[PDB]
Each structure stands twice: as C-alpha cells, then as structure tokens.
Design a protein around this ligand. Structure first.
Ligand SMILES: CC(C)(C)c1nc(-c2cccc(NS(=O)(=O)c3c(F)cccc3F)c2F)c(-c2ccnc(N)n2)s1
Length: 270
C-alpha cells in the first residue's frame, strides 16, 4: 500500500496536471500556419520529423497540409511548431507553479529546473495524445501525422522511438505525472543551488512511483516497469540534449524561437 504522504503526493500532482493540461487544446488558437556546412546539418535536422497537419473546423470542414521534400522550404513548419511549443511550455510552467514542492524552492532554482525540464515534460504530455496505431498526435482539432522505410525506419529517430516505446508501456495518468515530477526535480540541471533538497524530493517521487507500481500492477507484463520507466527518463534526457543543440543550430541559421522559447533555451536577445 501507499502511505498517506505518498497518496497526498500523487493527489497534488494529479490536481496540478488536471488544472494545467488542456488535453483538448481548446485554448490553442491564433497560431501561424505554413503559407556552408552548417546548412547541410540543418537540413538533416529538419528532415527527421516529417509530419502532415490536419485541422478539423468546428463546422465540420477539414484543412490538410502535406510538407514538401527538401529540394528554404524546409523552414515552412517552424513558426507553427514554435507556436505549439510555446503553448505547451506555458502549460508546463503552470504545472510546476501549482505544485507546493516546487513553489517552496527558491525562485532561481525554480527557473533553473524549468529551463532544464520543459522539453522533457512537453514530450511526456505529447505521449498521452500519441496514437501509436496511426502514428499521429491528436491535439484536439489539430492532428500531426507521421509521413510514410516504414515503422522500423521511423524508430531510428530517437524522439519517435521514445514515443512508441513509452506508449507501449501503457502507463496510467498517475505514472505519467510522477514521470513529469521525477524529470522536473532533477538535482543536476545547470544552475541549481538547492541540489540536496531537489535530490531528496526526486527520490521521494521515485519511491512513490515504485510503490504505486508495486501496489497496483501485479501482472507479469509489468515486471520491471519501474526500471523501464527510469530508463526511458534517462533516454529522454539524452534526447533533450541533442534536440537543444539541434534547435540552437537551426536558430543560428533561421531565427524562429518565440520569446518564451528564447527564455527557456538561454537566448539573450543580444
Ligand atoms: C507535436 C509533435 C509532433 C509531438 C512535435 N513536438 C515537437 C516538439 C516537442 C517539444 C518541444 C518542441 N519545441 S522545442 O522548442 O523544444 C524545439 C523545437 F521547436 C524545434 C527544434 C528543437 C526543439 F527542441 C517541439 F517542437 C516537435 C518538433 C518539431 C521539430 N523539431 C523538434 N525538435 N521537435 S514535433
């Protein structure tokens, strides 16, 4: 069983998630849509995603967008993705701010922790709207569908393999929100000062997750689930570092980051 404190911890996380995760994306509006050796790398960077976009109007109409092939056209999706990322990042910041364990840290460590983890928490939330059968992220009236190598070739992209592998674990809402907490409270992000406090908090969240899995998932399929989840969080941190470098290269060639994104990625405006 869980202790009273562990149940309180989960309930506080679940409450924060429900208050700040707009799962239907109803308040995502007014977003933009698609109308030397540095460049080869930036081309390789931009070619790894490849999603088409679908927008279902409230009246029943459907707009569909199919991206081009790399023949400047590789940048046509960046303003839209910047708007989606900014919307998600806002939700993530709200999440952190309604959690008492986070509100209790000094403001400087709050900022450091958010800068370190915003990408990761975004990816964790996107996994809950990922449909692994159709290869699509279902964000309310918006859908992002992976373009057609096959599934095996898709799994070569680490973010995509991450989404398929994590979806396969069939986690509960409580396990997702504890993964978000373990990621947010990482004592080893640059600029963290209360390293010991954050480390103890993280360990508590991880113990709560371990005990929750033990008390509620006895089936042979969920043997080692806790260790699988922690390995996924390690892999997600790696993905975060490579995507940060990728974003900074693209931003160096073709600026696109919003002010919130610039703040989170350490871009100063100078
Ligand atoms: C909706 C769906 C299909 C799940 C996506 N989410 C992101 C995504 C996920 C998390 C954060 C950001 N924004 S971001 O700021 O983290 C960032 C970029 F917007 C662009 C490049 C790297 C990067 F880290 C994203 F764009 C996608 C995405 C698109 C292009 N590049 C990258 N790295 N991610 S695709």
């Amino acid at each position: 069983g869980l202790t009273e404190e562990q149940r309180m911890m989960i309930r506080e996380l679940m409450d924060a998630q429900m208050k700040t995760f707009d799962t239907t994306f109803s308040h995502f509006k007014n977003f933009r849509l698609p109308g030397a050796a540095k460049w080869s790398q930036v081309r390789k960077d931009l070619c790894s995603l490849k999603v088409s976009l679908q927008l279902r109007g409230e009246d029943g109409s459907v707009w569909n967008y199919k991206p081009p092939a790399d023949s400047k056209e590789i940048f046509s999706l960046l303003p839209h993705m910047a708007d989606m990322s900014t919307y998600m990042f806002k939700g993530i910041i709200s999440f952190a701010k309604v959690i008492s364990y986070f509100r209790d840290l000094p403001i400087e460590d709050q900022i450091s922790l958010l800068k370190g983890a915003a990408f990761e928490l975004c990816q964790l939330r996107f996994n809950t709207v990922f449909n692994a059968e159709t290869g699509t992220w279902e964000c309310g009236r918006l859908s992002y569908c992976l373009e057609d190598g096959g599934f095996q070739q898709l799994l070569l992209e680490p973010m995509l393999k991450f989404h398929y592998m994590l979806k396969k674990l069939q986690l509960h809402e409580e396990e997702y929100v504890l993964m978000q907490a373990i990621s947010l409270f990482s004592p080893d992000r640059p600029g963290v000062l209360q390293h010991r406090v954050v480390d103890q908090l993280q360990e508590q969240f991880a113990i709560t997750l371990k005990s929750y899995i033990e008390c509620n998932r006895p089936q042979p399929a969920h043997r080692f689930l806790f260790l699988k989840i922690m390995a996924m969080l390690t892999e997600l941190r790696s993905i975060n570092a490579q995507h940060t470098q990728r974003l900074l290269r693209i931003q160096d060639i073709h600026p696109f980051a919003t002010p919130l994104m610039q703040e989170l990625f350490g871009i100063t405006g100078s």
